[PDB]
Design a protein around this ligand. Structure first.
Ligand SMILES: *C/C=C1/C(=C/c2[nH]c(/C=C3[NH+]=C(/C=C4\NC(=O)C(C=C)=C4C)C(C)=C\3CCC(=O)O)c(CCC(=O)O)c2C)NC(=O)[C@H]1C
Ligand SMILES: *C/C=C1/C(=C/c2[nH]c(/C=C3[NH+]=C(/C=C4\NC(=O)C(C=C)=C4C)C(C)=C\3CCC(=O)O)c(CCC(=O)O)c2C)NC(=O)[C@H]1C
Lengths: 313, 315
């Protein structure tokens, strides 16, 4: 099982007890967006990230009273239809909001039990995705598929390094393709222990297929209140991309000289086959619409890996 | 009985009947649908060889002027990209797409693929989070029926088509409509089954490699290529990978008898086999722009993946 989180008097995490860190409930988010939780029926805002005034423009404790019906009149009915009670936590709905102060905001919502989790990020206001799709499909074998996938993603994103990281049957990792900027260490061909991506992370990544750390030196922003009023318990944040990254993994990234990290799960036959794993040397917030392109490529690659491995075997 | 293709009509081949359906060489009709234009060019020199007879209307140029230039002169910014995207020996399924600002005809969508030493260039006029929301909705559908229903409803909302069907093949190649979204007043095809010969063997083979085809207007006359044969080979120009390809007259007749003015389908391919089609009808003629068709192409791949995932749970 998991330990209690740090904010509920749980022990500090070390290399001895990696597997037991409750990474899904850090009680905090990354500072490049804002997060609100809300009741499923009433639409009453229960928790907010302390930075919410920056993004939303409203005052701190005035939001706590209001309902989503009031705040988001046009979207609140769509949210009720899109995310009905009993739907999975993996199901997400997105909209673009013309907010007065902050301009265009991306809104991403999902449901966990009776709670709606709302994420707000800045956002902007072509054929590279279609061209990529056809390129992946005409790759003659798994090796070429891997090369095309890493190169495509680097071209779409500008990331300093993009790797395809394949899990062996014992969860040992191997870098089987790599696209990188000139003047970086090559990780191509190297292998890494299973504990670098511990079992609870692997399980989470089988269900929610994208996660990132935008800035490996940025401080997390707590939720207020930290605990969910409904349950007096931790708010599950595993399906929230804004979730704070495990401090252990943030230290690991800094030791590698990485300023920004992102990965996308490749899932084949219900199992985590591998990751499209990205690094940038400097901090880097990839905008939500470009992340959606990588999410699409995750599904396409999942399909193409099966197709290609049927030819291998 | 599987039998090889007849020569096309323009090489003295016989007229097609219900007795010889399967032998129609549907891939080499020598003609296109009138809502776009098509050019062929030599893959190394870029010399323009064939053009649809309507090419002047779309490109705003004299045919003799078009044919007297290379693609290097005609498309100075695209030509190097084409060469890089479509290297010699690449499969004919591989497509490169770009948007052009053409003075006489506004924004054109350019779609290119390579067959041997020939480049085939298709030109069509072109012009928020629905796809992402659809992706997650499809993945959360609890079983195969719910997946089929969400998929048909989603395609109908995106396109406005009068009818959208999920058409599933049985092992004997008969087909059945297993879900549909339809306009009010249309009679249901749900549960109906159809013979294998309605989608003959050469079409099914073609539809396993090239995953989208359409007939924008079921009464429109086809536009010949000029010249009709490829000058490189003095043989027919393969058009199986061109969406502008003229549709079999036999299928056009079938659609007119049903009261269908526009038709479109997307292949659902599972384990290298044609599992089914997303099949769409409109009562009036209807041109879906290339960027909206790309959304349906993505959905085709997602559905292929999800059908495999849902059927694995059904065991
Ligand atoms: C005591 C536990 C340890 C630990 C924990 C840990 N690791 C992750 C997540 C990731 N680790 C990754 C590992 C690599 N990245 C690379 O670039 C390479 C090789 C060149 C490796 C082996 C990756 C890719 C992830 C996923 C996240 C990402 O893409 O950045 C977590 C979970 C983090 C989270 O989601 O909150 C945890 C708890 N890592 C260790 O090395 C030991 C000390
Ligand atoms: C003598 C040959 C015949 C024949 C040939 C034929 N049919 C197609 C293509 C299609 N037929 C389809 C059939 C149906 N559409 C429906 O809506 C229903 C039922 C409600 C059925 C059974 C479909 C979906 C296609 C695919 C194209 C499309 O989506 O419109 C071809 C190939 C056409 C081409 O690609 O050029 C051919 C040669 N059909 C017959 O019925 C017999 C007379």
């Amino acid at each position: 099982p998991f330990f209690p989180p740090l904010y509920l008097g749980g022990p500090e995490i070390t290399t001895e007890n990696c597997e037991r860190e409750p990474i899904h409930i850090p009680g905090s988010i990354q500072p490049h967006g804002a997060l609100l939780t809300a009741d499923g029926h009433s639409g009453e805002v229960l928790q907010m990230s302390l930075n919410a005034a920056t993004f939303l423009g409203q005052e701190p404790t005035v939001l706590r009273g209001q309902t989503l019906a009031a705040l988001l009149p046009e979207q609140w009915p769509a949210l009720q239809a899109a995310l009905p009670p009993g739907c999975p936590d993996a199901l997400q709905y997105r909209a673009t909001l013309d907010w007065p102060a902050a301009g265009h905001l991306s809104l991403t919502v999902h449901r966990v039990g009776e709670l709606l989790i709302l994420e707000f990020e800045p956002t902007e206001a072509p054929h590279a995705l279609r061209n990529a799709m056809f390129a992946l499909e005409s790759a003659p074998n798994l090796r070429a598929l891997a090369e095309v996938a890493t190169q495509t993603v680097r071209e779409l994103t500008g990331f300093d390094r993009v790797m395809l990281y394949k899990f062996a049957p014992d969860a040992t990792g191997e870098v089987i393709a790599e696209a990188r900027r000139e003047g970086l260490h090559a990780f191509l061909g190297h292998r890494f222990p299973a504990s670098d991506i511990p079992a609870q992370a692997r399980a989470l990544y089988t269900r929610h297929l994208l996660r990132l750390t935008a800035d490996t030196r940025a401080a997390a922003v707590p939720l207020d209140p930290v605990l969910n009023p409904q349950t007096n318990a931790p708010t599950p944040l595993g399906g929230a991309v804004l979730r704070a990254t495990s401090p252990m993994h943030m230290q690991y990234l800094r030791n590698m000289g990485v300023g920004s990290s992102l990965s996308v799960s490749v899932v084949v036959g219900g199992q985590l086959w591998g990751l499209i794993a990205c690094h940038h040397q400097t901090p880097y917030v990839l905008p939500p619409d470009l992340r959606t392109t990588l999410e699409y490529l995750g599904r396409l690659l999942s399909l193409q890996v099966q197709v290609k491995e049927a030819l291998e075997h």
